[PDB]
Design a protein around this nucleic acid. Structure first.
Lengths: 72, 138, 143, 67, 189, 62, 101, 144
RNA sequence: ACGAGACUCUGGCAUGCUAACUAGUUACGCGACCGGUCGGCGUAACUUCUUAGAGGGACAAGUGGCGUUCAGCCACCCGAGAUUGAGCAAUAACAGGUCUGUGAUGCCCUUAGAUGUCCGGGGCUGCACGCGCGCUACACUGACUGGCUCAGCGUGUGCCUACCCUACGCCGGCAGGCGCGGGUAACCCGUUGAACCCCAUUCGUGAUGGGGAUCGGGGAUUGCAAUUAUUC
């Protein structure tokens, strides 16, 4: 049907992400995009920023299948 | 020095020439474990992980692959490698080592020493596919 | 870092309200001339940040887009790439994207309607003039 | 789907009924003697006939055969 | 090595069926690493039976015709979500897998009897092979429908579907439709 | 509704409307003194084990 | 020069092979360096057609097939010997030619 | 014991080739990059803005693999199935104009040289540069 | 006895044999890499993968069981193969189709106010619904940037047969151009650099970028003519 998702930085995007997003045991672009209801582009940008910081562990990378696990 | 035992899979084929050397193996004038799909690398790597690297540390094998189809090109590399080692050992060194390697691989996989009998059946007329016929009018 | 000012969800190009929830280079496809590879070409020659989000696009960038797309002579893009190459009435090769006139250019059958050609008659009946078989098929659009 | 036609059966019966002494129990020898003492216009037919001849030799050793 | 994918332990497999293990068993030397050895198993009755379970279940991924014969995608899609499952669960991508299938396969079905029976059916025992094959299809169909017009992608529906099947939850399409068919059969006993 | 196992001893035949059931004799392990006749659905074998949900139910014989 | 080739093109394998064996034996009898029978890849022409004269019935396509075969033999010899060995009562239905390098 | 030209991931090897070339910056680009369709199967405009560099690196790699690849070989390397919509598709050759521009761009830059059999081959200096790149990228993660 | 089977063709095996400088191992600056991959060369060993010839090979043959212990069937050792796929295909018939293949045709209609090649001028590319043989499609099972590594069957420059498949240099988005053009063949196309995928921006759950299916405008090569743009 229709799914209206925000496509810009907002209050919800950055919050509950520094701890509570890696606080889960299973993190993927699908998991984050479902449990935050945000577009995968900004989610992947945040994930790349965090990986450049080096606090999450990558298992697989792809344009449609990326796998993350907690590293903090 | 040379056994050129070849190996077949569909219409594709692979020839593994075996010689006395450093023990390192080359395929298509290339090292072993960097094939682009990286999906069936262990499938062709099975001989090393089965018979041990020491059995593969006394023979230099250059493998050339030719035949249509990329999945047909693979599945003959490992059979050619196993057959090349078997032929080289039987021709040159002795029987017992080749006997042990062939017994171990066969107890693991029968396909590593014998070729595939499967081949593409012809297509008979009256239909779009090989066995299938056109849609009847009722 | 992010832009908290000027933030608008609408990019007004022809006094129109386009959906901003879509990313850039794809949301602007709604215009009758900008879209598909046309939009890609205009944004590639605009030399802007195509990796940014549509929300982070600034007024200056849409103004640059309007300036580049108003003038096909801004970057010497040949006439054949445009849809109005070899225009009717007068030989015209520039670009003007605007509502209320583009549909009249679309209404180019009336000129040939006045010439009562076989194409004109076929256009009169609303049939596919390119030789498509209309024997009994074509049940859509008539209920 | 390995039933033998009456050609193979009858030829084997005739060969066994005339040339018992020459043939044995190993198919690879029955085929050779059969192709020696008979005109069999096909290798496959000779193989089938010799196989049934070997089967008939395995049959007779355990007792006389009706045919 | 001898482990599946070089990471999955081969020695901590459990019998867990006492005498049904002969049709669900990965403990022998034939248990190879990459589940891709072409389609020579569907050439004779029960020559599929000796095949390890991982191989047949990754084979059963390719449906709908659009992705027919894409065994590379199937092996990648199983390797993914295997490297996930145990991770999220913790046991052994294998042991969990056998438990999940055993829990997702029906054990009693309804069949019509007689030369002209057209009113009632009768309850019948289900053979190992039939239930396992059906269960694998159910699991694959549940993965497909969780990846059809849904926020979840491939190589991920299988992981949570298998986790639910091992858990015995009604979330998975497999066991829920198993229960529906079981209720139909129970009303048809 | 207990579940028990019984070893197949003789595959009696194939029945069914279009044919989907294998009628087979199974000897119980824990008794070995009683055997029953069951029509199992799906490809079955000789000497294997079968999981019955009801031990008091038998299908038609012959 | 010592660069002579002979070309035998035909349809049947038996007659062509008998001719090739006869020619190779004859050229072996005289002390000649002769290259053996080189077998060019046989070409088969496939013609799937209508069986019925008028279109009616079922679509039965006759797969008419013609296979043709070619043998090339090189040999270093005086050309007079080549001519004298060519006319050795060759088989009917085989086309034999002499080619110079 | 030496270094192999192809012992690296060909994808990452060609990416290293592209990075090396764009660091060099020698290979030029033509004026138009928006006129050519660039592929008879393409649906949009290419989304690289730098595809000339990758094209040149890949074509140099291909000429290293084998020579003689003239005007008639490049067009069929990327040419392929062309969607005609409802019609069953067919093979279409690549655009000849851009392929010819690529052939002219790779030429005259001390890497591609003429050969007796036609087409062109790789000058040994370019081969030495690629071998050095391969050795460095092998020592980066494959020799540690 | 015919039909079935046998049989002809085709493939699963040939390190046994006859063998080529058109396709090719193994062979030293020449073209190069801190002892190693590189279709640019030439004679050597003379055939293993390459082509096609003689053969040989598989026979329910060897074991276990079932079987009126028969004809056979079901498993296993071995083996390339333990049911490869087609061609042909009988009595006797259908008022089946074909008088629009017949210069195979009978008998009525013919015998020029014709029932043909002549302008091709003239049409099934005409439309108010349903039956009748496929593809695109419904996507996060994939459209999608390209990194790519690989086919098989074969027609192919003309004793009235003008119509031929494709490389050097340049131009142009496209149809093509000019000099010799590579083709009596596995030498030429071509180590047929084709389909998906191992990755590279978007879509991150969609009516849109897929569905371009319906209307604008620009070009060439055989066409006396392409209007009802049939052709790219």
């Amino acid at each position: 049907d229709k799914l209206n998702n925000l496509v810009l930085f907002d209050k919800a995007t950055y919050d509950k992400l520094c701890k509570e997003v890696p606080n889960y045991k299973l993190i993927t672009p699908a998991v984050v995009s479902e449990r935050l209801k945000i577009r995968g582009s900004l989610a992947r940008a945040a994930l790349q920023e965090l990986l450049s910081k080096g606090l999450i562990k990558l298992v697989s990378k792809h344009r449609a299948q990326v796998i993350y696990t907690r590293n903090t | 020095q040379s056994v050129q035992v070849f190996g077949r899979k569909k219409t594709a084929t692979a020839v593994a020439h075996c010689k006395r050397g450093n023990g390192l193996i080359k395929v298509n004038g290339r090292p072993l474990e960097m094939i682009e799909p990286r999906t069936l690398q262990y499938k062709l790597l099975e001989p090393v992980l089965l018979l041990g690297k020491e059995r593969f540390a006394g023979v230099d094998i250059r493998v050339r692959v030719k035949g249509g189809g990329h999945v047909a090109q693979i599945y003959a590399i490992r059979q050619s490698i196993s057959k090349a080692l078997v032929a080289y050992y039987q021709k040159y060194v002795d029987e017992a080592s080749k006997k042990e390697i062939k017994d171990i691989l066969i107890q693991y996989d029968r396909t590593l020493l014998v070729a595939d009998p499967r081949r593409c059946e012809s297509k008979k007329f009256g239909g779009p596919g090989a066995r299938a016929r056109y849609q009847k009018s009722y | 870092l992010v832009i908290p000012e000027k933030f608008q969800h609408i990019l007004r190009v022809l006094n129109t309200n386009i959906d901003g929830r879509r990313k850039i280079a794809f949301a602007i496809t709604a215009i009758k001339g900008v879209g598909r590879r046309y939009a890609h070409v205009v944004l590639r020659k605009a030399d802007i940040d195509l990796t940014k989000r549509a929300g982070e696009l600034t007024e200056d960038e849409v103004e640059r887009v309007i300036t580049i797309m108003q003038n096909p002579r801004q970057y010497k893009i040949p006439d054949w790439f445009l849809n109005r190459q070899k225009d009717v009435k007068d030989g015209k090769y520039s670009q003007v994207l605007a509502n209320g006139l583009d549909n009249k250019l679309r209404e180019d059958l009336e000129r040939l309607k006045k010439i009562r050609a076989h194409r004109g008659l076929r256009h009169f009946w609303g049939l596919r003039v390119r030789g498509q078989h209309t024997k009994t098929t074509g049940r859509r659009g008539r209920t | 789907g390995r039933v033998r036609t009456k050609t193979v059966k009858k030829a084997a019966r005739v060969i066994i009924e005339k040339y018992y002494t020459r043939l044995g129990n190993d198919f690879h020898t029955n085929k050779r003697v059969c192709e020696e003492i008979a005109i069999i216009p096909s290798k496959k037919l000779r193989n089938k006939i010799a196989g049934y001849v070997t089967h008939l030799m395995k049959r007779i050793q355990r007792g006389p055969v009706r045919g | 090595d001898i482990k599946l994918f070089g990471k999955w332990s081969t020695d901590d497999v459990q019998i867990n069926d006492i005498s049904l293990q002969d049709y669900i068993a990965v403990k022998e030397k034939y248990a190879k690493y990459l589940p891709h050895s072409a389609g020579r198993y569907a050439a004779k009755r029960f020559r599929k039976a000796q095949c390890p379970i991982v191989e047949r279940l990754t084979n059963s991924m390719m449906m709908h015709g659009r992705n027919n014969g894409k065994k590379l995608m199937t092996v990648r899609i199983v390797k993914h979500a295997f490297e996930i499952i145990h991770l999220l669960t913790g046991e052994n991508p294998l042991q969990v897998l056998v438990n999940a299938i055993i829990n997702s396969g029906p054990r009693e079905d309804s069949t019509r009897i007689g030369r002209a029976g057209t009113v009632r059916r009768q309850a019948v025992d289900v053979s190992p092979l039939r239930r396992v094959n059906q269960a694998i299809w159910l699991l694959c169909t549940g993965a497909r429908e969780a990846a059809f017009r849904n926020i979840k992608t491939i190589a991920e529906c299988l992981a949570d579907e298998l986790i639910n099947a091992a858990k015995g939850s009604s979330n998975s399409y497999a066991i829920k439709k198993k229960d529906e068919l079981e209720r139909v059969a129970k009303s048809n006993r | 509704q207990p579940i028990k196992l019984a070893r197949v001893t003789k595959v009696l035949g194939r029945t069914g409307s279009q044919g989907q059931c294998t009628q087979v004799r199974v000897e119980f392990m824990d008794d070995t003194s009683r055997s029953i006749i069951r029509n199992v659905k799906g490809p079955v074998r000789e000497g294997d084990v079968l999981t019955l949900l009801e031990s008091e139910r038998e299908a038609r014989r012959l | 020069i010592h660069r002579i080739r002979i070309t035998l093109t035909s349809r049947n394998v038996k007659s062509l092979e008998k001719v090739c064996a006869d020619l190779i034996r004859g050229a072996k009898e005289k002390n000649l360096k002769v290259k053996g029978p080189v077998r060019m890849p046989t070409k088969t022409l496939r013609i799937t057609t209508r069986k019925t004269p008028c279109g009616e019935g079922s679509k039965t396509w006759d797969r008419f097939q013609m296979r043709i075969h070619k043998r090339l033999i090189d040999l270093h010899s005086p050309s007079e010997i080549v001519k004298q060995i060519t006319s050795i009562s060759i088989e009917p239905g085989v086309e034999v030619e002499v080619t110079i390098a | 014991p030496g270094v192999t030209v192809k012992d690296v991931n060909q994808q990452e090897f060609v990416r290293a080739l592209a990075a090396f070339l764009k660091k060099s910056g020698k290979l030029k680009v033509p004026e138009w990059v928006d006129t050519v369709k660039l592929a008879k199967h393409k649906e949009l405009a290419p989304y690289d803005e730098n595809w000339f560099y990758t094209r040149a690196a890949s074509t140099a790699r291909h000429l290293y693999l084998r020579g003689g690849a003239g005007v008639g070989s490049m067009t069929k390397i990327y040419g392929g199935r062309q969607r005609n919509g409802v019609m069953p598709s067919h093979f279409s050759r690549g655009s000849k104009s851009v392929a010819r521009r690529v052939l002219q761009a790779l030429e005259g830059l001390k890497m591609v040289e003429k050969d007796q059999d036609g087409g062109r081959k790789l000058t040994p200096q370019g081969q030495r540069d690629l071998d050095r790149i391969a050795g460095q990228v092998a020592a980066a993660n494959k020799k540690h």
